[PDB]
Ligand binder design. Sequence first.
Ligand SMILES: CCCCCCCCCCCCCCCCCC(=O)OC[C@H](CO[C@@H]1O[C@@H](CO[C@H]2O[C@@H](CO)[C@H](O)[C@H](O)[C@H]2O)[C@H](O)[C@H](O)[C@@H]1O)OC(=O)CCCCCCCCCCCCCCCCC
Ligand code: CLA
Ligand SMILES: C=Cc1c(C)c2cc3nc(c4c5[nH]c(cc6nc(cc1[nH]2)C(C)=C6CC)c(C)c5C(=O)[C@@H]4C(=O)OC)[C@@H](CCC(=O)OC/C=C(\C)CCC[C@H](C)CCC[C@H](C)CCCC(C)C)[C@@H]3C
Ligand SMILES: CC(C)=CCC/C(C)=C/CC/C(C)=C/CC/C(C)=C/CC/C(C)=C/CC/C(C)=C/CC/C(C)=C/CC/C(C)=C/CC/C(C)=C/CC1=CC(=O)C(C)=C(C)C1=O
Ligand SMILES: CC1=C(/C=C/C(C)=C/C=C/C(C)=C/C=C/C=C(C)/C=C/C=C(C)/C=C/C2=C(C)CCCC2(C)C)C(C)(C)CCC1
Ligand SMILES: CC1=C(/C=C/C(C)=C/C=C/C(C)=C/C=C/C=C(C)/C=C/C=C(C)/C=C/C2=C(C)CCCC2(C)C)C(C)(C)CCC1
Ligand SMILES: [Cl-]
Ligand SMILES: [Fe+2]
Lengths: 37, 335, 32, 340, 65, 34, 35, 37, 82, 28, 34, 35
Amino acid sequence: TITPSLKGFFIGLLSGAVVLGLTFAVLIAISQIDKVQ
Amino acid sequence: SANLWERFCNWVTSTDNRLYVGWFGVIMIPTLLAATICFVIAFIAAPPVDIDGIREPVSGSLLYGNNIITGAVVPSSNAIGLHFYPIWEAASLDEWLYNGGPYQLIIFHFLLGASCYMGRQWELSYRLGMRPWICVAYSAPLASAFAVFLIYPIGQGSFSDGMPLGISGTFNFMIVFQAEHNILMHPFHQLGVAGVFGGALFCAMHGSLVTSSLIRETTETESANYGYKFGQEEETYNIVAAHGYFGRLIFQYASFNNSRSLHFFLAAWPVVGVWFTALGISTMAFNLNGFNFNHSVIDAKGNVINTWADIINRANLGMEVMHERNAHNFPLDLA
Amino acid sequence: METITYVFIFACIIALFFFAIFFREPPRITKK
Amino acid sequence: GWFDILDDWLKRDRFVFVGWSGILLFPCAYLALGGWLTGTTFVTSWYTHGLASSYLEGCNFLTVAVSTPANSMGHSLLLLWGPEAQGDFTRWCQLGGLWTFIALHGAFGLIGFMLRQFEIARLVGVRPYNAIAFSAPIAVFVSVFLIYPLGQSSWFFAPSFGVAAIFRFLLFFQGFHNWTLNPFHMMGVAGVLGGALLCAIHGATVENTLFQDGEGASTFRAFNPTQAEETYSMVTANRFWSQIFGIAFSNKRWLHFFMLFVPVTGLWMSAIGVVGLALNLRSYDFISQEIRAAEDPEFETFYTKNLLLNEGIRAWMAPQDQPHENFVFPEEVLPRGNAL
Amino acid sequence: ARRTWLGDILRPLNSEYGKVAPGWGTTPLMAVFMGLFLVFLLIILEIYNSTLILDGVNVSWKALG
Amino acid sequence: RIPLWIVATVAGMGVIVIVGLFFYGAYAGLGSSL
Amino acid sequence: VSYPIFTVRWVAVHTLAVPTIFFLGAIAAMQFIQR
Amino acid sequence: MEPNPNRQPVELNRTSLYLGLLLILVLALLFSSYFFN
Amino acid sequence: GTTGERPFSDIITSVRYWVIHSITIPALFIAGWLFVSTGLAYDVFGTPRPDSYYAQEQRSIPLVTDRFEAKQQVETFLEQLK
Amino acid sequence: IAQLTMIAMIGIAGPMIIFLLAVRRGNL
Amino acid sequence: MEVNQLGLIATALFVLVPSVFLIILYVQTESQQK
Amino acid sequence: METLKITVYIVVTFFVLLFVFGFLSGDPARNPKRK
Ligand SMILES: CCCCCCCCCCCCCCCCCC(=O)OC[C@H](CO[C@@H]1O[C@@H](CO[C@H]2O[C@@H](CO)[C@H](O)[C@H](O)[C@H]2O)[C@H](O)[C@H](O)[C@@H]1O)OC(=O)CCCCCCCCCCCCCCCCC
Ligand code: CLA
Ligand SMILES: C=Cc1c(C)c2cc3nc(c4c5[nH]c(cc6nc(cc1[nH]2)C(C)=C6CC)c(C)c5C(=O)[C@@H]4C(=O)OC)[C@@H](CCC(=O)OC/C=C(\C)CCC[C@H](C)CCC[C@H](C)CCCC(C)C)[C@@H]3C
Ligand SMILES: CC(C)=CCC/C(C)=C/CC/C(C)=C/CC/C(C)=C/CC/C(C)=C/CC/C(C)=C/CC/C(C)=C/CC/C(C)=C/CC/C(C)=C/CC1=CC(=O)C(C)=C(C)C1=O
Ligand SMILES: CC1=C(/C=C/C(C)=C/C=C/C(C)=C/C=C/C=C(C)/C=C/C=C(C)/C=C/C2=C(C)CCCC2(C)C)C(C)(C)CCC1
Ligand SMILES: CC1=C(/C=C/C(C)=C/C=C/C(C)=C/C=C/C=C(C)/C=C/C=C(C)/C=C/C2=C(C)CCCC2(C)C)C(C)(C)CCC1
Ligand SMILES: [Cl-]
Ligand SMILES: [Fe+2]
């Protein structure tokens, strides 16, 4: 159970979500700072 | 008769001929019919040719065991070198077919005619009031046939080293070339592939951009092609919409909006690239080959640290060491 | 048998050539 | 809703259009380009191919490259944090982690980019034939840098990213797969070669068949960026070729579609040929030829000749090209002609 | 048209044509299984590729009998 | 304001210099053969 | 007009601009390593 | 029965015939060698 | 024909620009230079120094031969003073 | 040893003989 | 020679079949009134 | 065989003359306008 390679998988699955996160965070934010019509 | 010859010249030069037999044509039409007719017969029925001058005939015709892919018209003998070998130079045809006579009759007439073909691509443009230069685009592919069929042989000292007239025979020309000149590692060949790759690339770019920005004039169930009539006044596509899309793909200033500048580039690129490729073969015809980085990177003690350049040399040695099995009697390959 | 097949197709392409050059649909202007 | 605001922002017309697609394209496209440029100058291929492969070691723009992983790795994705590298970066580098990095990243980058074309097309309201076309280059990349080695023993036999490192990929294919004799590779070249012709030929036909719309010699300025009349005599062009070649276009809509078709079809074919070389299902020999060559020692075609060139390529290269095989070919076993 | 026994019995199943839910309907809920599936594949993929080893799961012809 | 034509010919020579340093490096570096 | 500074274009331009010079600097240095 | 209203006529111009045949024939010149192998 | 961005032409000409980049550009350069010249790069990328391809005597290559115990195997290759 | 000294001058010379003209503004 | 027995028929039908296709169309097009 | 040489030679002369005496015949003249 929860072998070294299993831990690494999480590390990458977690390190991945973060990147998606900060990315959509930053994006969703700056998007909502200008776009007038 | 306004004067026979006066008339003749009016016909020849006539711009009302289905096919414009020009002044250059008067030389072209015959030379090209000889080249073509001799080839077709050769390729189908010619017998084995002692290409390497070592009495080891290479049969390359259909009736003698070849298929379209393997078959070819074999180069004149090496015993002959650069000497002129017209049929009237042989005790018999049997002798002429054995020393690869057909090869010369073909390359010479072809190269001759293919040049006039260029001379013609000018003439007709003149008789029609259009700007010249198209013939200059055709100078690239021609300058290649020349490099591969004549310059290389002159340079190397024999017509037997010219590119064979056949599919596999060509691969032979390539594989060996690489071994003796390491062409892949030569600037000119690289420029060549840039032009060819690029050409095909751009050919696709233009082709798509244009075709994709065509003004609608056709039904939902009607060939989008009919939306064009031969002899139209205005354009058939929105070159402004085209540029609009392409400018956004990359970025505006990196996109054409001037159809004339677009089309010049479109022609300039491949022609310029192939010009260099032709100059490559014409240059390596005097043994100024590609970069030789064999054993360049060496370590602190002097050991040789290989690079991909070396893995390439091994593959080249294999070719060197095996081509022309029985033709060499000495250490260095100076021919 | 193979030779015949190769020459035949070739002979067929040359025939095509002929018809294509000399029996195309005359290319008509404006009113097409 | 934020979504439409997120959208709004993205699809905003900037200098360098971002778009939804960009969220995939730019991250990858930059990483791929970056990893290459990195390895090219810093990472080595010693622990991997026993080869110096970066500027730092002495390689020049031609000899440098991001070499494939060891053959031991097999088809491993070689993730920075996977069983191989184990989170370690330097090791990753030495085990050729940078290859699957550039490979896989660039791969997504080609997806993103085609999507972009598709997205930008839609916005600008034009037909997506620029996207259809780009399927061709995807196929090549996919079949050659992925499908191929996926059929072989491992990533080690996929083309390494580099100039020279690609030439050996070529020489290899000749020598081992006798690839030049493949019906599909031929179609491939007929298309690329034939495509680079349409390109050149059409370009020249236009520039030398132009109407005069200016008083200058440099006719470039004489162009109406704003449509109207055809800038070149399509009618004259037709007559020219119809008299010099015998055949000639006469429907710019077709002439241009043809130009999309020729080179995209060519590359598609060259791909299939390789998808077959993955299983080694090559077009190596002609059996009827081999049988006659066996029984009769005087039968010689330019084909048999070639096969011998291959034998030499394989015998003299295999050793330093497949290190993991610890090949040892005694001088006496090496095929060679006379004297050379 | 041409009604038929079977035709009528099936008439209901095909009639709610353009009927759509309003706004972003079930989208968000969907976007989750989607992300779950994505992770699920990456796992079974990485297991086959021996990138994710799991004692008990031996990805070879062995573990057979 | 710095005149463009000067930004260029300066940034230009500047490249021939670095790219030329590379060419020299080819007969001295590790990429040498000596 | 009243143009801004830090823009999206700027970011990109630097992602390629900055590393490049850093490499050209690195490489320029290698021209002196020996044995 | 009612004349089905979803049908249109089919067409192939002379040029297409030619372009077609040119393709069929040459492919045949390209693959016959491998068929006879 | 335009978007928000300040026309490169103007910027590449602004004395402010050069006042900034005359500092920044050579900055980045001297940094990378030092990256190589300080031998740091060699360690960041496990790349061999001219005196680290082979051990003095050995003429064999440190070929990684198995995936999983690869990192471990590589470490040992560095051992024989390779 | 370092005749790069040479090049350098004869190098900024070309652009100079036009620059001085950009100053004395005239005949370019 | 020592070729494939089906090669001939494979090449024959490879040419005939699709050619016969095109031809059927072209002629039926060609004969459509007006 | 010595004959064929002769014939070939004659034949090539014909055409080569037809060629020179051709462009000589005021070729510039032959074209749309200015001549
Ligand atoms: C188609 C569209 C149109 C666009 C066209 C645009 C124009 C393109 C112009 C192309 C011109 C290319 C000219 C190349 C000149 C090479 C200069 C040279 O003589 O230089 C030679 C030297 C050689 O270096 C040395 O070469 C050897 C020298 O050794 C010898 O010399 C002695 C030392 O001096 C010793 O005694 C030694 O024992 C002896 O053997 C050794 O290997 C050394 O170690 C060292 O490597 O420099 C080197 O080559 C090292 C540097 C290599 C880089 C070269 C890359 C060239 C790329 C070609 C361009 C085409 C690309 C196409 C892309 C298109 C994209 C769209
Ligand atoms: C958005 C674009 C993008 C994309 C598509 C990729 C894609 C990829 N990267 Mg790259 N990367 C990017 C941006 C991107 N990257 C950027 C900007 C950087 C610089 C920081 C990197 C740096 C980088 C490195 C250093 C490496 C990669 C690697 C990889 C590859 C595999 C990694 C992996 O397994 O992810 C797995 C995917 C995920 C984490 C997605 C999870 C998404 C769901 C919805 C979240 C659920 C999360 C939740 C916690 C789970 C609940 C389940 C529960 C049971 C636990 C993959 C091709 C590796 C590689 O190239 O290997 C050879 C590698 O080593 N990337
Ligand atoms: C080898 C030659 C070749 C190259 C280099 C090439 C390159 C390119 N073609 C593009 C487009 C096209 N090419 C097209 C048809 C063709 N292209 C062809 C051949 C080529 N096309 C051919 C033969 C055709 C005809 C079928 C079309 C129809 C298009 C386009 O629409 C498109 C364009 O915009 O036109 C100008 C551009 C896409 C840019 C991009 O996706 O950025 C984003 C993605 C990036 C940066 C990821 C790169 C990832 C790759 C997989 C990894 C490469 C690894 C290193 C970075 C590279 C160094 C390695 C080498 C030394 C070997 C790109 C400049
Ligand atoms: C005795 C015997 C048997 C002899 C055998 C001889 C022998 C060995 C020959 C074998 C030949 C052989 C089998 C080779 C195989 C090659 C082959 C068939 C490849 C497969 C092709 C294929 C299906 C693969 C797909 C790739 C593909 C689509 C490529 C096709 C490329 C292609 C046909 C391009 C043609 C380019 C070309 C020359 C056309 C020019 C058109 C033209 C006149 C335009 C000029 C023009 C320009 C303008 O700008 C305007 C405005 C107008 C108006 C205008 O007109
Ligand atoms: C990998 C990786 C990463 C990152 C990184 C990056 C992103 C990088 C980048 C980088 C870059 C981005 C770089 C660049 C570089 C560049 C260079 C180095 C260049 C050079 C150039 C040159 C040298 C040029 C020249 C020329 C040409 C080409 C043409 C003609 C003219 C001239 C001569 C001018 C991460 C951490 C995520 C993770 C892991 C992996
Ligand atoms: C990219 C580009 C560019 C660039 C350029 C450049 C960079 C240039 C440079 C240039 C240069 C850099 C030049 C130089 C020149 C020089 C000269 C011209 C000289 C002369 C000289 C002489 C004559 C001398 C003499 C002598 C001496 C000195 C001493 C000893 C003795 C004697 C007496 C011999 C431009 C802007 C265009 C634009 C586009 C882009
Ligand atoms: Cl040979
Ligand atoms: Fe066009």
